[PDB]
Amino acid sequence: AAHPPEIIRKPQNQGVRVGGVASFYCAARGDPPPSIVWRKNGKKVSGTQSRYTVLEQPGGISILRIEPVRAGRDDAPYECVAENGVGDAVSADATLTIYEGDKTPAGFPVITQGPGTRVIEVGHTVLMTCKAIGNPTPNIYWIKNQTKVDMSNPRYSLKDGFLQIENSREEDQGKYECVAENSMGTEHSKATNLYVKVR
Missing domain, CATH: 2.60.40.10 (Immunoglobulins)
Structure with a gap:
C-alpha cells in the first residue's frame, strides 16, 4: 500500500435559503487511506460549533452539514483536505451562497x-x-x-x-x-x- 491522497469527489457550490440546511460532500482515496479535514475560510472547522457537523461515511466520504444556515456567518469557502502521510495533501473547496428573504x-x-x-x-x-x-x-x-x-x-x-x-x-x-x-x-x-x- 503506497499511494498519495486523491480527491475523487470535490465539493460543489451551494445556494441555500437562510435558516436552511447546507451540505458539502468530499471523497478521497490513497494508500493508506486519507483523513479528511474541513476548513472554513482556512480555519479548521470547530469541534465546538453546534451548527456544523461532520459525518464520515464509508467509501471515503466526508460530509459537512450546516444547520441552520446563518446569513452572515456562513457565507464562506469550505475546503476539504485529505492527507495520508504520502506526498502532498490534496484540497478542494466550494462556496456557499445564502439567500435572504x-x-x-x-x-x-x-x-x-x-x-x-x-x-x-x-x-x-x-x-x-x-x-x-x-x-x-x-x-x-x-x-x-x-x-x-x-x-x-x-x-x-x-x-x-x-x-x-x-x-x-x-x-x-x-x-x-x-x-x-x-x-x-x-x-x-x-x-x-x-x-x-x-x-
Whole structure:
C-alpha cells in the first residue's frame, strides 16, 4: 500500500435559503487511506460549533452539514483536505451562497409539500411525500438521519417524488427528509420521524 491522497469527489457550490440546511460532500482515496479535514475560510472547522457537523461515511466520504444556515456567518469557502502521510495533501473547496428573504435565483427549488411523521405496522408499506418544483426541474432524494437513503435497497423506491418503503421493518425507523436539488439551489424539507410498531 503506497499511494498519495486523491480527491475523487470535490465539493460543489451551494445556494441555500437562510435558516436552511447546507451540505458539502468530499471523497478521497490513497494508500493508506486519507483523513479528511474541513476548513472554513482556512480555519479548521470547530469541534465546538453546534451548527456544523461532520459525518464520515464509508467509501471515503466526508460530509459537512450546516444547520441552520446563518446569513452572515456562513457565507464562506469550505475546503476539504485529505492527507495520508504520502506526498502532498490534496484540497478542494466550494462556496456557499445564502439567500435572504425571497431574493432567490429564479427557479430555486421549492418544496410544496413535505413528509409528515408516521407510525407504521411492521409488514406494511408507507408512502412519504416530497412535492417540489423548480426550473430546471429538481432531482429529488431522501435522507435518513442525515445520511442518504440507499435506493439500492430492494424495498425502497420513489413513486412521484414520494418515497415508498415496502415490507416495513424496524430498521426503517428514522428521521427522514427530502431534498430538491437544482442548478440554482438546494432545499431540504423539515425532518420528521417514521416509527414502526409491532403486532
